[PDB]
């Protein structure tokens, strides 16, 4: 358990993914090209669970950047840290996929994934002991969404006993490109109820809520989005990232966070949210407070099944476990009391930049149905019109496909709802 | 990669290619004998403007688009014009006898004729791009060339292209300036025969922009010259996406597939502002919220009907120039808060908006002011059927009595296709009704 391999794909997938290997990079002392400046070991010890090490101790992402069209991977190409990614693990199409899941999965996306799939190979091939994969990508579009989770099957083929871990941005009408993503997004939550052992649901209605309510954007662009996200992906990582005793790899957090198979779907959380002092007991607090939650599902409406709390900066780790002792002990009827100390916490010495303690939120609550009912709502009063179909049946997709996509989010929901009540 | 090729048919078509070409190459800076200082690459590129143009070694950017006409008199003028060096003689293509106001004559007895060799010149243009995403085509609906050649065009660019994308800019008849009383004929033909070959149409009702020429800039009595110019302004708002490159900006396919919700429900309403003189336009800066607003006065349409009595399935905007999202995000509230924008129950209400930052330009001369900002809607209502039920009673009318008919028949053509035209026609007409009903 050490080597994960990164692949971001389609525009949603890449923006946030780049903006991740930049971030991380700093955390890490990696800069643009690749050698290494910080001041401390902490900084290296698990450095390889992420990078390759090059010659001339050059550090390089075990990252594969994916899309079916180059624009935005000419953008990342272009970017601040463009150059560290290796130059070959660029894998991309010219057709696009025009928002559209049938293209990705089926037609356009089925073309290239061969090519994608060599790339992870070669990146499997040099891991002394690969623990699996992270994606990112968004559900809402055609090359994330629908060639996303056709990557997921053929790696899961290939790779049936590693772990599979997701960043899924969710769509939402307030933050919305085009009507026809609550069907990409119902397509491709099936495929993840199946091929994932860990989703983190970032939605973007939950994000944009966040800019303007708290951050006080007037006009949240992508970008101001894409700073909460890539905090959160910092936060949420650092346990695989830093030495530490928690959850320290992909399937020891799977253990921790998913008690059926199916229910594998996060809400997370940060603080403090940013766009000059804070407590342990006001991180702990702002950390469970909805408002920080990135998925737009209220927790107080459902019950924690397991929940993983990150705390990053030098503080007192005696107050840190008091605290975490107090919101349990004062919010009790939100644990499930059939899972006794379903929350775990870990404390890791350094800061994310620009702050001096900060923490992350990993929340397995039955709540999630929320966002997925969602979903679900926009999905049928579309389809119970069969609107906008023709798009897909273009592609060689049926009807019965949409029907069966809907049946399992349903079930899903009907499954949480189980645990809710239990 | 991404290139589209335009085809110009008939008189219409081509006399608003001549103002379209005109206006893009004003837009991108290219001058009438083709060089465009400006581009640094000699010869080829992968710039946004070689969507639409394609390079000589020489530094010519020639316009990816074939002109067709039965007749030559119209296509003389380009040959013979302004911009005669911008395009390759083989790009301008003409018969000597034209379909005479007859469908049947364009679509059989005369565009037979020249049907393989347009469609050689096509294949031409095609073979020269290494991404082609689909063609534009222009064309009246009331001419013999504009309505028959067009769909014989059509029929046959599906057989040899497959599914690749093609867009109608269609002009729909008005009597102020139409030249045959058998243009519902026409356009009842062109439009059933055309149908399963299009996946989008924008409809430009001559008497739309007759009247916008009237009211708006003031125009006693407007000419081909004064409507093809508005009208090119408005064709331009629909491209730029495609010919420009920006933070914000949204590719046409996009919009399209919020525009298209069922294959044959396929023919938005555009709505453009603003539309003022250099006059009224001096000391007078329209504001983002006031040309957003201007949009849902029907007196902006290009198509005459009223959406306020019907449902949107879609509404998008498209700006350009000097537009940011905070502005255009509080004109939309505003308009939600005070208008009859009355969405279908299956369909999201939010507006799909695209910003390109390059500013309009007006063509020397002309009657528009040069505005530092512009719009198009493009939305998809209920409403637009309306021109058709208008053309379909006219149609009626005279069929009815079998009025002309045998000069069509005199041509090859049977009854039936008549009346097979006309009940797709009635389907159609259904089809919007229907999509209107709210979901049980
Ligand atoms: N807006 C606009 N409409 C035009 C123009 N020229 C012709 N029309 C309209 O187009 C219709 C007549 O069809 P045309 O395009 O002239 O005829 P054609 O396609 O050349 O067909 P044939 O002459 O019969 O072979 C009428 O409704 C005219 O008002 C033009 O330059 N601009
Ligand atoms: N948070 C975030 N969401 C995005 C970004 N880009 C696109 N999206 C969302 O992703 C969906 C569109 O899919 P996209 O990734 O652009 O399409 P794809 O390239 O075919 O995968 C919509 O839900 C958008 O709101 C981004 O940079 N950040
Ligand atoms: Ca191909
Ligand atoms: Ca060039
Ligand atoms: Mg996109
Ligand atoms: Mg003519």
Known sequence: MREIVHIQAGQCGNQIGAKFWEVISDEHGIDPTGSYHGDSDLQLERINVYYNEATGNKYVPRAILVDLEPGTMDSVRSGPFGQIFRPDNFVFGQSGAGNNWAKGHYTEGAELVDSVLDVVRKESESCDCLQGFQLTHSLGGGTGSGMGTLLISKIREEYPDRIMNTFSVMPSPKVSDTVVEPYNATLSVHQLVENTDETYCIDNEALYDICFRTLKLTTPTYGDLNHLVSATMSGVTTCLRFPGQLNADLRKLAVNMVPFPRLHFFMPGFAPLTSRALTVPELTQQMFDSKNMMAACDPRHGRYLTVAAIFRGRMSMKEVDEQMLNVQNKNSSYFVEWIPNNVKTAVCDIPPRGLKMSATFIGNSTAIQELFKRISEQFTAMFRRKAFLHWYTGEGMDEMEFTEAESNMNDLVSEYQQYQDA | ?440
């Open chain 2, 1 to 440: 990669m991404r290139e589209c090729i335009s085809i110009h048919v008939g008189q219409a078509g081509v006399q608003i290619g001549n103002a379209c070409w005109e206006l893009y190459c004003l837009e991108h800076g290219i001058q009438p004998d083709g060089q465009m200082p400006s581009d640094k690459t000699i010869g080829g590129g992968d710039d946004s403007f070689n969507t639409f143009f394609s390079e000589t070694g020489a530094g010519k950017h020639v316009p990816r688009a074939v002109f067709v006409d039965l007749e030559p008199t119209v296509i003389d003028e380009v040959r013979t014009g302004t911009y005669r060096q911008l395009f390759h003689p083989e790009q301008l293509i003409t018969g000597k006898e034209d379909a005479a106001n007859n469908y049947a004559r364009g679509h059989y007895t005369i565009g037979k004729e020249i049907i393989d060799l347009v469609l050689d010149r096509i294949r031409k243009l095609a073979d020269q791009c290494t991404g082609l995403q689909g063609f534009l085509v222009f064309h009246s609906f009331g001419g013999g060339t504009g309505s028959g050649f067009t769909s014989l065009l059509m029929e046959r660019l599906s057989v040899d292209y497959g599914k690749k994308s093609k867009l109608e800019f269609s002009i729909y008849p008005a009597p102020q300036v139409s030249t045959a009383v058998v243009e519902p004929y026409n356009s009842i033909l062109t439009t059933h025969t055309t149908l399963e070959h299009s996946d989008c149409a924008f409809m430009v009702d001559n008497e739309a922009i007759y009247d916008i020429c009237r009211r708006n800039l003031d125009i006693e009595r407007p000419t081909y010259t004064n409507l093809n110019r508005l009208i090119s302004q408005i064709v331009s708002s629909i491209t730029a996406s495609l010919r420009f490159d920006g933070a914000l900006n949204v590719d046409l396919t996009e919009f399209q597939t919020n525009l298209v919700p069922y294959p044959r429900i396929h023919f938005p309403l555009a709505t453009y502002a603003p539309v003022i003189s250099a006059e009224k336009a001096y000391h007078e800066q329209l504001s983002v919220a006031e040309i957003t607003n201007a949009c849902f006065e029907p007196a902006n349409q290009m198509v005459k009907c009223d959406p306020r009595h019907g449902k949107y399935m879609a509404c998008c905007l498209l700006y350009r120039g000097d537009v940011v999202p905070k502005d255009v995000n509080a004109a939309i509230a505003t308009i939600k808060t005070k208008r009859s924008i009355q969405f279908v129950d299956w369909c999201p209400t939010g507006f799909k908006v695209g910003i390109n930052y390059q500013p309009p330009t007006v063509v020397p001369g002309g009657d528009l002011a040069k505005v530092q900002r512009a719009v198009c809607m493009l939305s998809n209502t209920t409403a637009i059927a309306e021109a058709w039920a208008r053309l379909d009673h006219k149609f009626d009318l005279m069929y009815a009595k079998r009025a002309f008919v045998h000069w069509y028949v005199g041509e090859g053509m049977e009854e039936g296709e008549f009346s097979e035209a006309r009940e797709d026609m009635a389907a159609l007409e259904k089809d919007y009704e229907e999509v209107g009903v709210d979901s049980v």
